[PDB]
Design a binder for this molecule. Sequence first.
Ligand SMILES: CNC(=O)[C@@H](C1CCCCC1)n1c(-c2cn(Cc3ccccc3)nc2-c2ccccc2)nc2cc(Cl)c(C(=O)O)cc21
Lengths: 57, 57
Amino acid sequence: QERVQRLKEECEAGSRELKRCKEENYDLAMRLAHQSEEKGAALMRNRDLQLEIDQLK
Amino acid sequence: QERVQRLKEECEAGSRELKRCKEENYDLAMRLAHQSEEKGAALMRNRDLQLEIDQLK
Ligand SMILES: CNC(=O)[C@@H](C1CCCCC1)n1c(-c2cn(Cc3ccccc3)nc2-c2ccccc2)nc2cc(Cl)c(C(=O)O)cc21
C-alpha cells in the first residue's frame, strides 16, 4: 500500500546521497594524488639541496 | 508484498554501501591531511637548508 511509496522515496534519497558521496570520493583521491606529487617534489628539492651542501663542507 | 520486501532489501543494501562509502572518504581525508602536513614539513626544512647554502656562498 503506502509502504511502497516511503520505500521508493527512501531509495531515491539514499541513491542521491550515494552519487554525491562517490563524487566526493573521486575528488578526495585526486587531491591525495596531487599532495603526493607536491610532497615528492619538495623532498627531491631537499635531496638536491642537501647534496650541494655536503660538497661545500 | 513481493515488491515491498525487494524495496526494503535494496534500500538496506544501498544504505550499507553509503555507510561504507563515507568510511572510505574519511580514510582518504585523513591520508590527504597527512600528506599535506608532510609537504609543509618538507617546505619548512627547505627554508633552513636554503639558509645554510646562502652562508656558504
Ligand atoms: C541497480 N542499483 C544500484 O546500482 C544501487 C547499488 C547496488 C547495490 C549496492 C548499493 C546500491 N545504487 C543505487 C540505488 C538504486 N536503488 C533502487 C531504487 C529504487 C527506486 C528509486 C530509486 C532507486 N536503491 C539505491 C540506493 C538506495 C539507498 C541508498 C543508496 C542507493 N543508487 C546508486 C548510486 C550509485 Cl553512485 C551507485 C554506484 O555508483 O555504485 C549505485 C547505486
